[PDB]
Structures are given as structure tokens and as C-alpha cells.
């Protein structure tokens, strides 16, 4: 809205109350969406006599789509926005804007993979509240989304070529944070509750639990099919439904909402201790939704308008 000139402010995303608020409040919300197409076919009659053509409207299927939520600065306050395309969260931003509202966030509960999110503008970005603390979750933000097709039948598809390449970019930006000549290893989750061992995510009401073991099973810089298919379990979870006061909000029914989205981020956790020699080991993490919100709110901070 109004870009501050020459002015620099201090950001600290790991101490950002937007994240806490946005996390306590905020439900998903779906609206009906019509995506109409028109078909036109030629009318051949005899021989070469395709004089006419028939235009006709198609694509009735009504689907439910996620509604963008914006966090708006309260009365008498504003939001400071970092425009530094490769900002790291903490520190002073030399390029700053002032907006009344954050961008359009489509809340999506999930672990391991960040869905329907904001792609990084320049190159792949990795972030951590503290890289030296192996417990602190690492937030990866791709600059190119990886399409992932999930059917209710119980499986998700991912172009292996696209994934392999996405891994390389991640591995490299990690090799760039933990010694330029380290071997980067991706391994399945070390174990735990289903929500944090599988690629767990919502499709409005229904929850997918996906065997993401094939996504995190490779070694990098150590000198099958064309499409990876993940096995899924689909369970409903009413207790995870939106409950504001007396009202409970029942999300759309099934074939209703379109499962399958775009991977724009990951949630890795680093293996510490002994693994501090030649190679480093990263496993799919998350299960902590505050990390999710930070993935989108790193570049905002709320202040008083002086």
C-alpha cells in the first residue's frame, strides 16, 4: 500500500504474535465455485461440407474451494511487510512496505509437506528459529510448486522427475548451511503418532495419512517409475472440525472438495549428535501447526501507526 522510503525496521518471526493469534482463531471455510467451460464442435453433414459449428456450455461439477483469510491490523495499528525477496525472518529489513492486511492465506492443516502455500520469489529458501538446535523445525520454501494428485480412492501421485529435482535444490541449500562438502541424507520419519509419521493433511473434514517414505529416502552428493504413488488412509476427525462457541462448522462432504494440491514447502527436522561428521540426516517433521503459520507469516510484523 505505502512503501516506506529509506526506513528500516526490526523483524523477529519467532516472536510474532500474529502467528499465535492466527493459530488459535482461524478456520478453513469453503465456498462453492463454478468453473464453466464451453465446447464447440463442427457439424459435418456430407463431404467437406462442415459449414456450421455448435457452441455449447460445459463443466457443471460444483466443487468447494478454500476461502483466503487475511489478517488485518487492528484499529490504530498497521502491518510492516518485508519485500526483501530472500529474507530470513530475524534482522533489519532495508526494504519495507506498510499494508493494512496480510496476503491471502488458505489454512491447510498438515505435517511434512506444506500445501497451497506461497512460493519463494527468487531461489529456494530454508528457515529455522535456530539452525544449531536440531529440535527446532526447519522450514523449506520451494520457488517452484510440485503438483500432487490425491484421489479418495486412497493414494497420491507425484511426478518423480519433479520431486527428484526439488530434492536436489533442497539438499544443495542445506549443504550450503551445514558445510559445503557434506553428504545430505533424507530418511523416513524416526517414528511416532500417525499424524507425524505419515504425510498427514486435511481435505475438509476428511484426513489423509500418506506413506511419504518414498519421498524421503535418498542420499545426496555421494560420489523406478516415472511417477511416485503414495499409499493413503482416509479418516474423518470431528474433533478437528471448526468449533466457534456453540456452533460447529461441518466442512463440505467429499467428492465435494477437491483433494490434491501444490507442494510449496516442507517441514524437515535434523538428526543431531553423532551425525556431525561427513553427512547430515534430515527427516520429515512438523505436526506443530505454529511452524506452518510461520511459513507464511515470516515477513509480517504488527506495529502502532505513529
Amino acid at each position: 500500500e505505502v512503501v516506506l522510503v529509506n526506513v528500516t525496521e526490526n523483524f523477529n518471526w519467532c516472536k510474532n504474535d500474529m502467528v499465535e493469534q492466527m493459530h488459535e482463531d482461524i478456520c478453513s471455510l469453503w465456498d462453492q465455485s463454478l468453473k464453466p467451460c464451453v465446447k464447440l464442435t463442427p457439424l459435418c453433414v456430407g463431404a467437406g461440407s462442415c459449414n456450421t459449428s455448435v457452441i455449447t456450455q460445459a463443466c457443471p461439477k460444483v466443487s468447494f474451494e478454500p476461502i483466503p483469510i487475511h489478517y488485518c491490523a487492528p484499529a490504530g495499528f498497521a502491518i510492516l511487510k518485508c519485500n526483501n525477496k530472500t529474507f530470513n525472518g530475524t534482522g533489519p529489513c532495508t526494504n519495507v512496505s506498510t499494508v493494512q492486511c496480510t496476503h491471502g492465506i488458505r489454512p491447510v492443516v498438515s505435517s511434512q509437506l506444506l500445501l497451497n502455500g506461497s512460493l519463494a520469489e527468487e531461489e529456494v529458501v530454508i528457515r529455522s528459529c535456530n539452525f544449531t538446535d536440531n529440535a527446532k523445525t526447519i522450514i523449506v520454501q520451494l520457488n517452484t510448486s510440485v503438483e500432487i494428485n490425491c484421489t479418495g480412492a486412497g493414494h497420491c501421485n507425484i511426478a518423480r522427475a519433479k520431486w527428484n529435482n526439488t530434492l536436489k535444490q533442497i539438499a544443495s541449500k542445506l549443504r550450503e548451511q551445514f558445510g559445503n562438502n557434506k553428504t545430505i541424507i533424507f530418511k523416513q520419519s524416526s517414528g511416532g503418532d500417525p499424524e507425524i509419521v505419515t504425510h498427514w493433511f486435511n481435505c475438509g473434514g476428511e484426513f489423509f495419512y500418506c506413506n511419504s517414505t518414498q519421498l524421503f529416502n535418498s542420499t545426496w552428493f555421494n560420489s523406478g517409475s516415472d511417477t511416485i504413488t503414495l499409499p493413503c488412509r482416509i479418516k474423518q476427525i470431528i474433533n478437528m472440525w471448526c468449533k466457534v462457541g456453540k456452533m460447529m462448522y461441518a466442512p463440505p462432504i467429499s467428492g465435494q472438495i477437491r483433494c490434491s494440491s501444490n507442494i510449496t514447502g516442507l517441514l524437515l527436522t535434523r538428526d543431531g549428535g553423532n551425525s556431525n561428521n561427513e553427512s547430515e540426516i534430515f527427516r520429515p517433521g512438523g505436526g506443530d501447526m505454529r511452524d506452518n503459520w510461520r511459513s507464511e507469516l515470516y515477513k509480517y510484523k504488527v506495529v502502532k501507526i505513529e
Epitope: 524416526s190 517414528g191 511416532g192 500417525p194 505419515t198 488412509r233 505436526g287 506443530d288
Partner: antibody, heavy 128, light 109 residues
Framework: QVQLVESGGGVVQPGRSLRLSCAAS????????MHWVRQAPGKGLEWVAL????????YYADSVKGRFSISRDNSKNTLYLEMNSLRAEDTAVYYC?????????????????????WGQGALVTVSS | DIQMTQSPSSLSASVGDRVTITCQAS??????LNWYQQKPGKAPKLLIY???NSETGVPSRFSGSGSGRDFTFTISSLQPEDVATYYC??????????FGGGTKVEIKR
């Protein structure tokens, strides 16, 4: 070095309350469900309470519903169980246990999968 | 809320023998059943998980089988230190339950 150490054992008179802890270590605590199990002196094993990883969903036995409180601080890797209105029948050994994760040998998504590692126990006697 | 039955309550058996314990659930629990072993004084140990899976480290002679409402823990060759009380647990549902007191195996020498 998967270890679960209970602490806060001792005495407590009928009617009072007590809070036990479980210093977990050697495994990402914030990823596993935790169990409380007690054992009357000389008697069998009785499951008392469960709590999922994030600390939200808690599950209790009918033998405690409304008296006991399970909780956890995934930041201090500690599991808690506060008990109110202790009777003479609550005098038992109290174990905390880690729920097995979701091993590949499973294939369905259950509430719990059962304990694997237990603590060495903490003795609580309800006596005046 | 599922009731678990074990048999026998107690049993004497010479070292080297084969001990069989049966578990029987009030209702179908697929293969969601664990077997626990509690030596005297010490804290319980997981031997078999999900009907028929051996924990890692658990001796080679311990096994499990079954599904539905009928299960079976089995020591192929009893050893002197296998003397303990054995519990079976179901996790098809909460609350979790076992046969209170399980099965006490003791050696005959």
C-alpha cells in the same frame, strides 16, 4: 538411550492430591503418545490414561474419569499426571510408557498402538 | 470397552518345554494385540506387538499368532529366566484392557 524416569512418588492422605512427572529422554518426546499405567501392590496391570503427541486429545479410564488429569510440556520433555481425591484403592505403582509409533507392520490408523518402553515406576501410597 | 480372557491363569512347566498362552477377546479386534512380560519386581516389557511381531532385542524364542478374537503367545523352549507374569493388551479401542493378573508361568525343576 530411551529412558522414562518417574518422579514424585511418596505418601498422600485420603482426599488430598498429588502430581507425578516423567522425565523422558532419548527420543523425540513431542512425537509420541504417552501412557499412564498403575499396578495395585500384588495385582495386575490397569491402564489409567493416555495423551496424544500435541497434548490435545486425552483419554481416560472409567476408573478415574473426573479425578485424574494427564498433561505434558513438550518443551521440558516431561509428562504429568495430577490426581485428586485419592482413595485407599489408588495406592499403587505408577508407570509411564511410550506408545509404539506407527510401524509399517500396522496398516490402519488407531487411537493408540500400545506401550513399548515403560518407566521404572513410582510408588504412591494413600495413607494417613 | 473390550473384555480380555487369558488361559491358563497359572501354569507350571519344566525348562526346555513349550508354553502356550491363549488370549480371547469379547469382540473382533483384527490383529491389534500386544503381549507383555513382567518379571518379579521389574517393570513390564514389550515382547510381541500387533498379534505376531517380535520387538527388536526380544529373544528369538518368543512368538505370537492369531487374529479376530483368538490369539496365542508361545515360548518355544522355556528358559530359567522366562519365569514371569504375562499380559495381553488390545488397542482396537480405548480404554485399553488386559486380563487382570494375566498368566503366571513358573518353572518345575
Amino acid at each position: 538411550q530411551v529412558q522414562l524416569v518417574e518422579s514424585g512418588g511418596g505418601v498422600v492422605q485420603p482426599g488430598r492430591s498429588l502430581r507425578l512427572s516423567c522425565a523422558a529422554s532419548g527420543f523425540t518426546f513431542r512425537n509420541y503418545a504417552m501412557h499412564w499405567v498403575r499396578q495395585a501392590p500384588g495385582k495386575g496391570l490397569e491402564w489409567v490414561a493416555l495423551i496424544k503427541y500435541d497434548g490435545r486429545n486425552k483419554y481416560y479410564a472409567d476408573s478415574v474419569k473426573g479425578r485424574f488429569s494427564i498433561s505434558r510440556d513438550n518443551s521440558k520433555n516431561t509428562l504429568y499426571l495430577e490426581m485428586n481425591s485419592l482413595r485407599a484403592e489408588d495406592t499403587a505403582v505408577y508407570y509411564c510408557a511410550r506408545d509404539i509409533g506407527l510401524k509399517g507392520e500396522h496398516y490402519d490408523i488407531l487411537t493408540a498402538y500400545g506401550p513399548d518402553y515403560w518407566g521404572q515406576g513410582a510408588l504412591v501410597t494413600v495413607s494417613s | 470397552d473390550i473384555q480380555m480372557t487369558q488361559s491358563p491363569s497359572s501354569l507350571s512347566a519344566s525348562v526346555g518345554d513349550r508354553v502356550t498362552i491363549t488370549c480371547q477377546a469379547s469382540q473382533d479386534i483384527r490383529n491389534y494385540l500386544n503381549w507383555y512380560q513382567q518379571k518379579p519386581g521389574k517393570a513390564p516389557k514389550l515382547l510381541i506387538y500387533d498379534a505376531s511381531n517380535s520387538e527388536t532385542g526380544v529373544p528369538s524364542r518368543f512368538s505370537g499368532s492369531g487374529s479376530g478374537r483368538d490369539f496365542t503367545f508361545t515360548i518355544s523352549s522355556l528358559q530359567p529366566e522366562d519365569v514371569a507374569t504375562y499380559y495381553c493388551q488390545q488397542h482396537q479401542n480405548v480404554p485399553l484392557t488386559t486380563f487382570g493378573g494375566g498368566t503366571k508361568v513358573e518353572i518345575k525343576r
